[PDB]
């Protein structure tokens, strides 16, 4: 088995970062790959990257780390390689805490004239990943009927984002008028809130 030292690791820009790959068999060399957000893996081992390892234990070194290096890293083996890959390390980057930009959207005419009705609430560019969101409607905290999806570290911004989508039918959208999207975060104890009211059409 080929095992990584950290499953996930964090380090701020400028500071050093090190991760090791340990096999269950001795080899003369070791490889490293970097897969970023949407792209495929790139063969790796700029002047930031370098390799250091003695016998079995190898490790990748990154001095002067930058926003670009926010990626998932995989190790594969050198001499004796049935070409298996390692467990993989997710390297995120430390950053000052950013308040999320909240934006709520009513369901379009196209969707309303097909039975359904989805209410989206974007929360873009924040830190850290942690973010609680309780959908409300007429002051009642909704629990189910919600499908969230988070982005991973931005390659240059180094900030996470999220899109929560409350999904209901056109009929169940009439019972309640005032739709609300609340959001909790480290930056402000007072939560970020954006809301809109139907029966008030534009």
């Amino acid at each position: 088995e080929l095992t990584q030292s950290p499953a996930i690791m964090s380090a701020p820009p400028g500071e050093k970062a090190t991760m090791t790959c340990s096999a269950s068999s001795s080899v003369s060399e070791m490889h490293w790959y970097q897969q970023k957000s949407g792209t495929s893996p790139k063969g790796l081992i700029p002047a930031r990257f370098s390799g250091s390892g003695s016998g079995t234990d190898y490790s990748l070194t990154i001095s002067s780390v930058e926003a670009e290096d926010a990626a998932t890293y995989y190790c594969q083996q050198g001499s004796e390689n049935t070409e298996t890959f390692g467990g993989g390390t997710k390297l995120d980057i430390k950053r000052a805490h950013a308040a999320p930009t909240v934006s709520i959207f009513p369901p379009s005419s196209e969707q309303l004239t097909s039975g359904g009705a989805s209410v989206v609430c974007f929360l873009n560019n924040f830190y850290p990943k942690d973010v609680n969101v309780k959908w409300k409607i007429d002051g009642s905290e909704r629990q189910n009927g919600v499908l969230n999806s988070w982005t991973d570290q931005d390659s240059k911004d180094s900030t996470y984002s999220m899109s929560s989508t409350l999904t209901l039918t056109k009929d169940e959208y009439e019972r309640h008028n005032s739709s609300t999207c609340e959001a909790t975060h480290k930056t402000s104890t007072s939560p970020i809130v954006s809301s809109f009211n139907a029966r008030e059409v534009t």
Binding site: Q35, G43, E83, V120, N124, T202
Partner: protein, 222 residues
Amino acid sequence: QVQLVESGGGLVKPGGSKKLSCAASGFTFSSYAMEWVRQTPEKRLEWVAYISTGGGSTYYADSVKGRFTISRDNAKNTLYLQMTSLRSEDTAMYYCARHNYYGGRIYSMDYWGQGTSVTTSSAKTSPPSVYPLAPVCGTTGSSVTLGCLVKGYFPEPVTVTWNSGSLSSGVHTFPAVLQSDLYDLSSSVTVSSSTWPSQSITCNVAHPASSTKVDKKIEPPA
């Protein structure tokens, strides 16, 4: 430049066959040993198959023994992968890679393709419903944010761009979320307040399986 292009992927049902291909160019294909590497939705890179410089020796992984069959075509500069008894866990993003550094250290997967989606399920191929997300007001901010809801489609992937890719910075296309044999995705775009609604914005959706190239313009609801 060197280039690798995977092809022939899509949807398959469990216990079915699907043949992939990797178009090679920019190098003497016959002087290199190719690799197939697949990646899960969980994103665990897993080597599946290998073939030598000219088909002299081939290896496989425990997962894909017997069922998978790697082959190549050096005349046409074309790698292949045949799949036989596909399972749900074979659903992955199938990458194609070279295997050659040759000197100081030894061999390595130096060049990779752009992947190709292979999905294993007995569910229906459904096209996407593109709904425009305009905000409920025309109030003044520093910048205004809009969106595009790619509702109820199957399978992955779906390609979302803004104004034919001209609008890129300040865009957030989120990961899809599968629920009841149906994926849902929703991209967002931030623009300066003076631009919209005075200037047009359009999300460009494309779902390969259904061949549905859609372009829905974002307008305010007055």
